[PDB]
Write a protein that binds this ligand. Structure first.
Ligand SMILES: CC(C)C[C@H](NP(=O)(O)[C@H](Cc1ccccc1)NC(=O)OCc1ccccc1)C(=O)N[C@@H](C)C(=O)O
Ligand SMILES: [Ca+2]
Ligand SMILES: [Ca+2]
Ligand SMILES: [Ca+2]
Ligand SMILES: [Ca+2]
Ligand SMILES: [Cs+]
Ligand SMILES: [Zn+2]
Length: 316
């Protein structure tokens, strides 16, 4: 909408107070004009019609329980935009400052979040498996990263290419979580998953097998559920990325860690310059090796560590 940029205040899903960029024209709308061509947050009103209504508020204060998922979807989209711009010189998901749209309160008791080809969408959860999913910064950045992938490598959402697509979203979701630097970890979704169980998460990148996901190519899922295991076999790539950054010895193979920032540079370059819609795990290894060669040189530790990490997870 046309209006003037304003700054509201509210509380997110976890009860934390934050300022949000809004737009005033009769109402205060969840429309942040400070980033690209805007970040816009919508109310789906417990239905499945999308996007729903641009979020309108009478007083620019967002402390109601119903407001909390919207506050976080809006704010964490801003953090994610900032990460891509400041760290990778990428302007929004398309590289040309496309408007970023999110809807919250999607459906009833909906235990998921998604990118629908055009926007991000967040369920509220059922209060048992999830609380409102925009409360997880890694979740928000995971969804927005699906948009980045759509506009870059375009990895098809099935089998190995789809597991790479998933892992890219988990990797950058985690790097955004570290960028914001609030309780960062290598787990996925811990802030919104299972409110009645402490210390768990939807997935782990540091130890995927803690939740039955594979951590070695010899343990990959080959069936048809989950689009050929896209959320399962992502553990093999997530583990490789974790090893590149943090190091470790895994199935007897030692990896010298090179840190999160270099992991992010290598995988961002692979995603944007080398991966294609049909890339498989072996092709991802080659793309990561070439990316690290471009950035650091063929004789570098960074290239050696990429090779060690893929060796450790059984990907040649
Ligand atoms: C980070 C977590 C909290 C959310 C994350 N959702 P997610 O982002 O993985 C969501 C899952 C989904 C698919 C279809 C319909 C509805 C929902 N997938 C999704 O949005 O895929 C977007 C996409 C579009 C084109 C090509 C490739 C990908 C996830 O891991 N979902 C698990 C629970 C799953 O769906 O198994
Ligand atoms: Ca209000
Ligand atoms: Ca965390
Ligand atoms: Ca996390
Ligand atoms: Ca939990
Ligand atoms: Cs789990
Ligand atoms: Zn995903």
């Amino acid at each position: 909408i046309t209006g003037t940029s304003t700054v509201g205040v509210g509380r997110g899903v976890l009860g934390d107070q934050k300022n949000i960029n809004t737009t005033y024209s009769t109402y205060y709308y969840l429309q942040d004009n400070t980033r690209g061509n805007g970040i816009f947050t919508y109310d789906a009103k417990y239905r499945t019609t999308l996007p729903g209504s641009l979020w309108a508020d009478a007083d620019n204060q967002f402390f109601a329980s119903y407001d909390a998922p919207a506050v976080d979807a809006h704010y964490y989209a801003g953090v994610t935009y900032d990460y891509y711009k400041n760290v990778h010189n990428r302007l929004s998901y398309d590289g040309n400052n496309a408007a970023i749209r999110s809807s919250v309160h999607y459906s009833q008791g909906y235990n998921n979040a998604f990118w629908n080809g055009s926007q991000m969408v967040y369920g509220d959860g059922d209060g048992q498996t999830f609380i409102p999913l925009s409360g997880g910064i890694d979740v928000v950045a995971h969804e927005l990263t699906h948009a980045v992938t759509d506009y870059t490598a375009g990895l098809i959402y099935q089998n190995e290419s789809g597991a790479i697509n998933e892992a890219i979203s988990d990797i950058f979701g985690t790097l955004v979580e570290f960028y914001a630097n609030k309780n960062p970890d290598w787990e996925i979704g811990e802030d919104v998953y299972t409110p009645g169980i402490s210390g768990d998460s939807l997935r782990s990148m540091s130890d995927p097998a803690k939740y039955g996901d594979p951590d070695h190519y010899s343990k990959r899922y080959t069936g048809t559920q989950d689009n050929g295991g896209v959320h399962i076999n992502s553990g093999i790539i997530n583990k490789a990325a974790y090893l590149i950054s943090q190091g470790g010895t895994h199935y007897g193979v030692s990896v010298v860690g090179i840190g999160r920032d270099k992991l992010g540079k290598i995988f961002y370059r692979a995603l944007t310059q080398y991966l294609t819609p049909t890339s498989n795990f072996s092709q991802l290894r080659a793309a990561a090796v070439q990316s690290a060669t471009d950035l650091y040189g063929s004789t570098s530790q960074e290239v050696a560590s990429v090779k060690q990490a893929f060796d450790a997870v059984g990907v040649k």
